Paper text:
To investigate the correlation between mechanical properties and functional efficiency in proteins, we selected neuroglobin (Ngb), a hexacoordinated heme protein, which is expressed in the neurons of vertebrates and is involved in neuroprotection in hypoxic conditions and protects brain from stroke. The structures of human and murine Ngb present a large internal cavity behind the heme, that is connected to the surface through a tunnel, forming a pathway toward the heme for gaseous ligands (O2, CO, NO). Like many recently discovered globins, Ngb is characterized by endogenous heme iron hexacoordination in the absence of external ligands.
In the CO-Ngb structure, Phe 106 is the residue mostly affected by the shift of the heme inside the cavity. Its mutation to a Trp hampers heme displacement, leading to low CO affinity. The mutation of the Phe 106 to a Trp leads to a shift of the segment Lys 95 – Ser 107 (termed extended FG loop) toward the bulk. In particular, the side chain of Leu 103 is pushed towards the bulk by the side chain of Trp 106. The shift of Leu 103 leads to a shift of the side chain of Trp 148, located at the end of helix G, and to repositioning of the C-terminal Gly 150.
Numbering used by the authors: 3 to 150
The structure:
Amino acid sequence: RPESELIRQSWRVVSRSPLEHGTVLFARLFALEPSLLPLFQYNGRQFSSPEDSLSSPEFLDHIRKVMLVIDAAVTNVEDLSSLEEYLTSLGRKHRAVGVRLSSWSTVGESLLYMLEKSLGPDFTPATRTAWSRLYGAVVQAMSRGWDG
Ligand code: HEM
């Protein structure tokens, strides 16, 4: 695939500094869908504002976890079937946390925004298409966690 190469090349730029980039992803996400903010319940407390989340070590650790799952998907882009069972359980966990299926599309748009802003001119419509497809496939596996 030429898509798989576009993904690997674009990810190299981002994975240089995963917290900085994942911070962008989450800041964008809460800008679009502020109702996701209460789902992060560290020590039984909710964040009042999006900027509160950025001072939480647990929240920042979650950004790292996110970037690592995406790294795994990129590493396995040629065959994502090997992550399917893991992603299904990840889906189930997030359903339990309170993430709705519809919110995954917002996460996807936030990921695309982060890529667009990091790559600028290098974020070509083919790169965008490749990432939408990869992310779509991740979500599809995760959505198998919603059957019950
Ligand atoms: C709306 C988006 C999301 C919300 C509200 C959310 C919320 C949470 C919460 C509350 C936890 C449990 C506490 C913690 O470990 O920090 C969690 C765990 C986790 N999240 Fe997310 N999350 C989101 C998106 C994602 C995405 C997109 C990924 C990866 C693609 C991801 C990967 C993880 C991982 C790997 C864990 C640890 C799961 C485990 O093994 O127990 N999360 N998430």
